[PDB]
Amino acid sequence: GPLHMIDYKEIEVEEVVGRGAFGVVCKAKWRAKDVAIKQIESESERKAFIVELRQLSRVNHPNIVKLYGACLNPVCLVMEYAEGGSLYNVLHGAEPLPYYTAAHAMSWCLQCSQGVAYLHSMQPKALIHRDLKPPNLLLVAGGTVLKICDFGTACGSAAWMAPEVFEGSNYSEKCDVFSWGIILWEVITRRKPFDEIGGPAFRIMWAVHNGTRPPLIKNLPKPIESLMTRCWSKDPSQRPSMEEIVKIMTHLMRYFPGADEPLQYPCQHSLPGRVEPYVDFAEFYRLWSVDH
Ligand SMILES: CN1CCN(c2cccc3cc(NC(=O)Nc4ccc(Oc5ccnc6[nH]ccc56)cc4)ccc23)CC1
Numbered sequence: 001g002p003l004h005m006i007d008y009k010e011i012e013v014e015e016v017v018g019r020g021a022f023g024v025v026c027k028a029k030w031r032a033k034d035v036a037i038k039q040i041e042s043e044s045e046r047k048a049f050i051v052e053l054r055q056l057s058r059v060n061h062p063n064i065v066k067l068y069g070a071c072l073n074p075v076c077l078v079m080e081y082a083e084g085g086s087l088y089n090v091l092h093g094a095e096p097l098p099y100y101t102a103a104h105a106m107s108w109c110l111q112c113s114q115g116v117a118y119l120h121s122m123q124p125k126a127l128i129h130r131d132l133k134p135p136n137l138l139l140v141a142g143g144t145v146l147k148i149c150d151f152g153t154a155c156g157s158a159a160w161m162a163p164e165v166f167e168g169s170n171y172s173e174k175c176d177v178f179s180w181g182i183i184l185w186e187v188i189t190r191r192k193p194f195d196e197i198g199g200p201a202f203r204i205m206w207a208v209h210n211g212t213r214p215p216l217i218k219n220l221p222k223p224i225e226s227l228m229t230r231c232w233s234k235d236p237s238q239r240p241s242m243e244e245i246v247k248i249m250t251h252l253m254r255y256f257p258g259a260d261e262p263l264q265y266p267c268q269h270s271l272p273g274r275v276e277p278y279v280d281f282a283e284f285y286r287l288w289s290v291d292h
Contacts, residue, residue, distance in 0.1 A: 003057045004069030006030070006078055011037060011071070021152035022048055027081055034083070035068060039076040048152070049075060058122070063115030065138060065149040082147055084139030090263065091134060091190055098143065098263035102279035105187040107259035110249040111146040112137060113180060117242035119148075120173045130171070132179035133160040134186065142262025158201040158208075159193040164236055166205050174236035180245065181231025184224075185214045190278035191271070218274045219281055221288075223252070255287045 012029040019025055022045040023038045040049060056067040056077065066080040084090065087108060090098060112132070119127040129136075131150055138147045158166070162178035165171045182193050193214050194204045213232045216225065227248060233239050240248075253259070 001057050001060060003053075003067065004078075006069040006071040006076075008071045008074060008076075011035070011078070013037065019151075021154045023076075025151075030068070030078060033068070034081040036079045036081045037076050038079070039074060046075060049077070052150075052152075053077060055127070059119070059127070061115055061118045062145075063111045063147055064118065065147045080140075082138035082140045082149075084141075084143050084263075086135050087137035087139060087146065087187070088134035090139060090143060091187065092192055095269075096266045097269070099265040099267040100143070100263055100279070101258060101261075102188075102277075102281055102284060103253075103256040103259040103261075104143070104263070105184075105279050106249065106253060106256045107144070108137070108139075108146045108187055109180070109184050110246070110253060112148060112183065113242055113245045113249055115146075115148040116176050116180065117246045120176070120242050126173060128171075128173045129176050129179075130165065131157055131160075132176050132183070133157060134183060137183075142264070144260055144262055156201055158204040161205070161208075162236070163205075163209050163234060167209060172236060173242075174239050177231050177239040177242060177245070178233075178236075180242075181228050181239075182214065184228050184231070185217070188220070188224075188277050188279055189214075189217060189275055191275065215273060215275050217277050220277060221281060221284055223248075254291075255284045257287075 010030060014027045014029065017025050017027045017036065020038065023040050025036055025038050028035050028037050040046065053070055065082070067077060068080065069078045070076060071078065116129060116132065119129060129148065129150065131153060136149050136151055138149055139145065140147060160179040160182045162171065162175035165175045186193055194207065197204050197207055211234065227245065231239050
């Protein structure tokens, strides 16, 4: 695909906006467009940068972060800046946190599935994310458009990780489906998966390996529960494909209007077998029965 070689003189570096496993991400400008640049900080890091650059060049989708180009001196990636920050931050970040709706929760999960389904349907060889979680989901367009990315890990992903991955089996693209199942629960409940557990990360791995999943949700539509709990399955072959998730979720959006309303209202918080959803399903059930 069309990957621009870039002159660092033309980039107007403004400020640091967090960082990944390697490198430091900075907000900048470049030919009158807001850009996130991921600059390298030691000559040692170039092998990983090449894999990242070769990956980002292949992918071209509305729900995966767009690489504009890369400067080879000094070595940096140049991506479209996502103003909204991570989904992790919108859900769990610093107060004041934004209000959002079941429609938003479903639209984020739909958009994420669309992006992963694109990765999975790629040729000659299918790409697998293997680290799908809200810190790697960026928001744009007032919190309404979600973009998959990967900040990378050094050596916290345990909560969203499929059991077959962390147990050192042969994993497949069905590990992404597991992760998505957990993200869906997370955006619906606005709870971090496994804070009831806590302690070090191997506690979560152990828990999940013995069958522990997140708790079920009071008054969750049976169809959404069916989908969610299939994605949690120990056996990877019993989880749906992303093609299937995208089709289902696309169709459920009929009963979840208002996903294009930007996040703009504030929210104040409390936390109680089951758990209450943060979002409200009254309107879903209302719209559903009108059809059925
Ligand atoms: C085995 N692989 C697993 C993952 N793979 C990947 C799949 C899809 C996207 C990927 C993006 C990458 N790169 C990437 O997204 N880097 C990156 C992420 C965030 C970032 O920071 C921002 C970018 C834009 N707006 C921002 N606003 C605040 C930070 C920020 C800078 C670089 C790296 C890998 C990717 C394929 C197979």
